[PDB]
Amino acid sequence: LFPQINFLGSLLIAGCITSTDPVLSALIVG
């Protein structure tokens, strides 16, 4: 099994993949 810090851990990595911002930000739009 994976650790409990997997969620927060994937957040740091996913951050690079994102580059922009959460999908929610797209809903609010500039």
**Residue 3 near residue 9 (C-beta atoms within 8 A):** yes
Q: What is the spatial distance between Cα 12 and Cα 3, in angstroms, rounded to a whole number?
A: 15
3-state secondary structure of 28: helix
3-state secondary structure of 1: coil
Q: What is the spatial distance between Cα 14 and Cα 10, in angstroms, rounded to a whole number?
A: 6
Distances (CA, A) of 25 to 11, 15, 18: 16, 14, 12
Assign residue 29 a region (left: φ > 0; alpha: ψ between -120 and 50; beta: otherwise).
left
Experiment type:
NMR
State which H helix or E strand residue 11 sits in. helix 6-18
CA 8 to chain centre: 9
Q: What is the spatial distance between Cα 20 and Cα 28, in angstroms, rounded to a whole number?
A: 14
Residue identified by tokens 């994937």 is: 10
Q: What is the spatial distance between Cα 27 and Cα 3, in angstroms, rounded to a whole number?
A: 32
